[PDB]
Amino acid sequence: SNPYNKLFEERIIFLGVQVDDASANDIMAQLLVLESLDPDRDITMYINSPGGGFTSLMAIYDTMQYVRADIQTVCLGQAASAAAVLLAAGTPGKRMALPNARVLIHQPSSDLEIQAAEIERMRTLMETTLARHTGKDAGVIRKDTDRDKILTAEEAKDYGIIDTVLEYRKLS
Amino acid sequence: SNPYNKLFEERIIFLGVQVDDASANDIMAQLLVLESLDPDRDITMYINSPGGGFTSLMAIYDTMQYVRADIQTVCLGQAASAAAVLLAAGTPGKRMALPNARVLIHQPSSDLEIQAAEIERMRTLMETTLARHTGKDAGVIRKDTDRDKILTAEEAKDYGIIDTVLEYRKLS
Amino acid sequence: SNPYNKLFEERIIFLGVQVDDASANDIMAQLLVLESLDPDRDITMYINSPGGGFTSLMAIYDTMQYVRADIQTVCLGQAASAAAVLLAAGTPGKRMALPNARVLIHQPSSDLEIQAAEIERMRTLMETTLARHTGKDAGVIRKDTDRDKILTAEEAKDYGIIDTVLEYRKLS
Amino acid sequence: SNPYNKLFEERIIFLGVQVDDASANDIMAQLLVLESLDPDRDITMYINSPGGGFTSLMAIYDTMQYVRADIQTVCLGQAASAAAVLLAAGTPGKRMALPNARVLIHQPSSDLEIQAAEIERMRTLMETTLARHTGKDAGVIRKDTDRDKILTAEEAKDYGIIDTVLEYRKLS
Amino acid sequence: SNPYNKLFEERIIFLGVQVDDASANDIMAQLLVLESLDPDRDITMYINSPGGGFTSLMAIYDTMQYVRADIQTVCLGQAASAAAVLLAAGTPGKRMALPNARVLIHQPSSDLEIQAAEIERMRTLMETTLARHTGKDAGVIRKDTDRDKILTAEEAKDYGIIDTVLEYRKLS
Amino acid sequence: LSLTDSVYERLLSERIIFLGSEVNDEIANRLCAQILLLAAEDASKDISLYINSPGGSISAGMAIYDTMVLAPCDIATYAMGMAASMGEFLLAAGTKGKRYALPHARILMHQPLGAADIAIQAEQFAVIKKEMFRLNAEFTGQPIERIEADSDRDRWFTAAEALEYGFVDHIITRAH
Amino acid sequence: LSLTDSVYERLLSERIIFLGSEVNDEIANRLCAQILLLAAEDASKDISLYINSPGGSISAGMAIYDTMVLAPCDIATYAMGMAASMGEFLLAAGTKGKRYALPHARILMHQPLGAADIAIQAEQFAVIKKEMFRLNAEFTGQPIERIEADSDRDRWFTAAEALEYGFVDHIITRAH
Amino acid sequence: LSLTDSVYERLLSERIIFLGSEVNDEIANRLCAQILLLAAEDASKDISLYINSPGGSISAGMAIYDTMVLAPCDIATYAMGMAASMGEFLLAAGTKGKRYALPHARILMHQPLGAADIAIQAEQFAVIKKEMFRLNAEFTGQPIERIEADSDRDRWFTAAEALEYGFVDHIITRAH
Amino acid sequence: LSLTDSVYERLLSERIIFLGSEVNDEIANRLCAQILLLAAEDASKDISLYINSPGGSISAGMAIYDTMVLAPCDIATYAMGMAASMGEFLLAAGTKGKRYALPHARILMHQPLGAADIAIQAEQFAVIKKEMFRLNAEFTGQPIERIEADSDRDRWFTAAEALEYGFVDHIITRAH
Amino acid sequence: LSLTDSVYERLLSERIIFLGSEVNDEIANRLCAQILLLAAEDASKDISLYINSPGGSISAGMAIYDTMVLAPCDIATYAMGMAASMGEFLLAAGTKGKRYALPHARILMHQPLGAADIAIQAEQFAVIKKEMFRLNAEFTGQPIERIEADSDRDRWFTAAEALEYGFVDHIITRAH
Amino acid sequence: LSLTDSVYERLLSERIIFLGSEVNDEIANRLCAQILLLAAEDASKDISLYINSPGGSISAGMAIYDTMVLAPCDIATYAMGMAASMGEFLLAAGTKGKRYALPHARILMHQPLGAADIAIQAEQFAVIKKEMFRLNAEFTGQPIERIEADSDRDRWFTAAEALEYGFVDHIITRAH
């Protein structure tokens, strides 16, 4: 079988790239199967996606906070302003990231006034969600969000997103 | 196998996104299989769809009210004027929703006079269906429907759609 | 497996939407398999299609009248001038319909004279078929066919198409 | 079954051609399955790709350096400035290459200033990664990178990328 | 199953038509599976392809010379300047060809100077590879390559490519 | 220019306009522009309007009617081909005594076929459809209850029936 | 303009119109416009109509026939190429004595090939098809029962057969 | 040129401009160019502006309004077809006493429908929408609180209602 | 106009027509129109017809032949490029003594390549193919049984062979 | 030609040029060509430049600026619509005393948005961006550190704010 | 014609040619045709050549260079926009003393970028690339070894650097 099945057998949810309305119903269905099978074993999630939507982001954020199994987020590659929220929504002390990670935080993505209103609402909701986990204030995150902030693995440990950086386990 | 099969094994009907004439024959076929297999165990339905049609909406509404098994609707994400009716058509006391839900209620979707007549008919039918479950009057729902009403999880509990908001089950 | 297989295991023929020359060879093949397997158990058919052709309609009408097993037609959703004939061609006393059904009866669908001749022939054939089951006269059905007649579940019981309207089996 | 499955059964990761954001999630999933199955047996990787991206290159580079199993890179064909880094990131003493290999080293692939900044950053990161394994200095590799350098199997052994060239095992 | 699987069960590698960068990773994966299963039994290869690339040709040439199992090349149809090298790279004394074979030898297939340089390099490499097996000199093969040389099964036996022509095994 | 674009321009100098397509948001603007140009060139002549339209919308034809009424000239409407739910209204919109018809014309007395603003779209269509049924009774002189019964049946007409119905006033069989 | 759009304009000044395509809702409007322009330019000359049409509709050709009858000039119709179910009606529509035909013409006496309004579409097609069978008998002079038998068989004709049938009056072999 | 491109040029010489499409980044430039050309040709006449627009944007119509105000001539705006959220602003932008309307006009008092720069896009749209609500009250003379209530309801108007509302000043039923 | 559309118009004033494409339902109409225009302009001069056609149909070329015969002028046909099954018939259709050919011409004596009406389509093709084999024998003067044998073999010719065969009368090597 | 292509040509004779699209490699060439033509026609008049551009590139606008400076005439730049990161530079490039602006203009002070040669592409963009920030300070007269702070914030302006900022010199509310 | 096709024709009468696209097999033919036309019209004046080309091929620019040398006039080349590997060769190809440049020009000294005949394609490209490196040293006067070192580095230049390098002779800041 494909390696994705062998990973899911070990309760591994490999989030795909460019998560959207169609790619969220598959990751929200795996969080409900592993929670009913074994409710005390943790669930790890390898984060790799160059951005995505927001209408489906809040549907996975609370879903990760609704299951009883603890979430261990491991950042692989980058996270373009959408996967960083899921990386910071994991269990405190189990949020890991490779030393070559790029935690990006930028702006997410009548039909002109209500559109700007919904954009401001989702922006302040994302900022509140980020400040709830990182222990910071919404003003600082809003000041660091207007610019295309590019955080490295070492710059994200003291920022509040990740708690530990994984080292190389090479025997030679 | 796919996680959808493992969910359906637990009598879970995960409604897809953008339900239409073609996506309704699959959800109406699952309500007839789980009803003949085990008729007293409830059937839960995770709601996640950014709107849809209405010609197939009334075909699923009465189908949910025709099976003997109780329907437990859990809102995941949003409901754009079409999935809200199915969310409110569940069993009283079992209509749940995540704290980040967006229950949207707006206008649904010679060929000009009869079209407007059918639109008015389906609109008043939807309003009567919503007032039958929420215990309100059709006038208030019609007054709240002309505008793009956006209801939150806390604003929908006292509105009559949902009965309880799910809390976070995190152990840490 | 898919729920369609679990339904067909219970001798359930779920007619798809927009039946045509290609979608009729699949419903005519299921009526010949269930008739050879168990010839005294009835066969139920859930009707859901927003219209269709007529060249394949008469191929399924006589096929439903050729098998020895009784046909129990249950209308789900609507029937746009093509599925209504199959709904009325079922066994008398077993033609059911949900309370939110829309039994539509309208006009069905040298190459100008012979085309009109074939259209008139298929129209009068459909009217005779409808009058044979509903016990009415072809003139009344022709008078009610020229206009886009929209029959409800309660207006179709006394019309002769359906015999009983299904009620809600909710325990709460 | 396909020969790829029979190769993966022997812990062989055959990297495809033109690795990108979509072709990296499949090679990063195989490095996590073989590491959990048998952690002391080495994993060999046959390199064959005419270039690729860089945003997913650093996601596989550290992944190869994170697993406990040793990586044995064998170059098949060519490596156009992207697969050469993975060929040089293998275990020292196990980096092999066929005598007809072409280890290519060239330039990898407001939206004009920040784009050039990210290009310079990824370029210097690639040069540092190449100098860390080859034991050279970043200046020499930068001087040899501006031109379309084409290294042969014999010219890459003394360069620091590969350690040994495979000979022909023909018995006649 | 397909006849290709039944052939591969007998260690038969049927090279497809128009071998390219994508069709070479499948023939290079079969040479590594049959070599690990049974290392002393020979591997036969039926040659049938109307030309191809060269960047992937040298990746299969050395691969055929790297496995320990002997290669028995049998030409079926024709070989348009690309499959002839693989036909001549087989084991001496086991290179067969049908009496109606057409061993074609013609020209293979800033971006103008370096392109011509790479073309000349691959051309002289192909000529050296052909002269190494046929026992001729590169000058004669270069003189016979500029023109569209069409060699028959009888004209290729004394040329050095094939060693024996297969006869008809008809019993009547 | 082109072949069909030059003959129309040469006929425009002789105060002759054409309508050979379904009146929509495009053809209506060109028709009003041509009518206004012919009215500004001379205000003491007639404007021949040859009508051949298999259909069209009412919102666009109402503007053509207002433009025809605004022009101080005398519009002479003809039934060249067939009028289908939009050519009859412009054929009867001409001055009484200049509405001619060819002996093989087919006037189709019929009404035109036709998000969240469908309510106001139906209200605006219901206020101009009754206005058309008033102008049709004013032009033809027939009772108002006659066109409301002849419109839904798709009753086709001939050059002789439209003469006695009230649509046209003459049948040009051999004239200049 | 273009090459083919300039020669037609230069021939229009000499009162010469062409028909080299299947008559439809488009070509019919241009033909009527050209005929009306040539009739308004001069009302004392002849209009040469070269007919070469492999087909067409009857609803559009009826308008061309009415336009030809309305023009006070003398239409001289010619059979340049081949008439197929629509060119013969316009070839015989000209004045008696000016209907010529080239020695390699092929007149095809045939009728034209041709939702919820198909009933009225068949009734309107059945009222103009019998009218065509009356004008064809009036022009050619043959009995009415002859064309109703020669129309369904797709009986093709030649320049010599069409002369004795009643279609044309002369066969121009060497003229001006 | 073409047929519709020649009539507009011939009407431009008579100081007559048209607007028969949705005003956007394209039609607005042509309208301002025509207005400036007519103002540079003569500065002592009137410019007839026939308005028929089913919609459009406000950022493009503001430029047309500024161009109309800049021209020293007297713009005479007419309601030919229907004004929908952009034709009314240009209809009331003309000089007081020259804003006419056809008896079958439909003025729709409504506001126009409408990455990372959406904030400044909403701020720029909120500074020109209130400016439009000031000019609309200055032209029609109605209180400012009336248009802010009649704009969201999509209240359609007629030629008689727009006369008493303050949009137009006359209803041309039979004029030159 | 264009570059190639202006040179042809300038050459038309000097009584020079061209044929550089496969004769079909389109090019044949333009050729007959040009021939009729040149015949109506003057009836006492010659019309140079340069032939270069790699193919074509016979039903369309027959009309061109009838048009050439109808014109009272003297058609001077030339073999500019190569005649393939349709250019030879028009090359030999000119008056005897004016059929020239360039020294590098290739005349291909061959017949043209070509539902439920295929029977009448084959009967109509069998009545015009034998007529072509009669005119070809009448023009070239060769026996009729010679072209029926030289047509199926696709026998190509040269400027010298076509001179003695009967196609052309002169070989212009250096003339005006 | 066309409708929009004729009004621009007629306005070119009156020394009036337009810019209604995003300046790119295409529009810049036409603008420089028109400016050079107007300068070669007369060297003692003014050239009105109406600016309405929602964007554009700097490499193309620099050529337009050099062409405006090369012309010995007096460029009178106007703010017709809205200037977005490229119209302001050409609006302030005119001679001091002739830079006008309509009362509903929106000047957007912003910089333009923008293989293996990206290094030299960034070096060439960094040498012309600082040059633009020098000419902007030379024209408006504001300190250099002001535009470098007002450029990144996307600070929009009005006709009254741009007057006191230094962009324009007058606000034409009612002029000729 | 069009808007951009009329200004170029009007400037051609004043002996002014343009080059605003990448020189290829198309633009080179038009440039040589314009140069030959301007040389045949008058052989005692100057031809202004405004150069703005982001690239192009050498095989096509060599023909333009030979055409410029063949013309007996005095070509005055200008650096309007930016020269990239093909505009510099034509800028320095003009007569010494008439090679001007705008103060914001960017001359890019670079060589152009560029089956079974690739060998002769490389041999033909290697015989014209060395010829270009000889004419570049002959025009600018710099040693031959300087351009062979400045060509591979993609060294960009400014209007002041190109003046002292040898490309141009003057910097027109304020002239006619």
Side-chain angles (χ1 to χ4, degrees), chain F residues 1 5 8-9 12 29-30 32-34 36-37 40-41 59 62 65-66 69-70 72 124 127 131 135, chain H residues 1-3 6-8 10-11 14 18 20 50 52 80 102-104 106 108 154 156 172-176:
Chain F
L1 294 177
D5 295 332
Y8 286 160
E9 182 146 37
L12 189 62
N29 270 315
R30 185 186 52 92
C32 309
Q34 287 175 357
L36 287 157
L37 175 63
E41 282 186 355
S59 67
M62 282 300 181
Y65 169 72
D66 302 303
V69 175
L70 173 64
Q124 291 177 5
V127 82
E131 185 76 15
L135 299 180
Chain H
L1 294 177
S2 169
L3 178 60
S6 164
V7 158
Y8 286 160
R10 292 176 65 178
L11 279 170
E14 300 157 15
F18 270 87
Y50 301 130
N52 179 22
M80 188 176 62
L102 293 179
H104 290 171
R106 298 188 308 270
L108 277 163
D154 299 331
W156 57 279
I172 45 184
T173 43
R174 260 302 283 107
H176 302 275

Side-chain angles (χ1 to χ4, degrees), chain G residues 105-109 150 155-159 161-162 165 167:
Chain G
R106 299 188 308 270
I107 287 92
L108 277 163
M109 184 55 185
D150 291 330
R155 181 183 180 188
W156 57 279
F157 287 130
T158 316
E161 297 182 359
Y165 194 87
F167 289 141

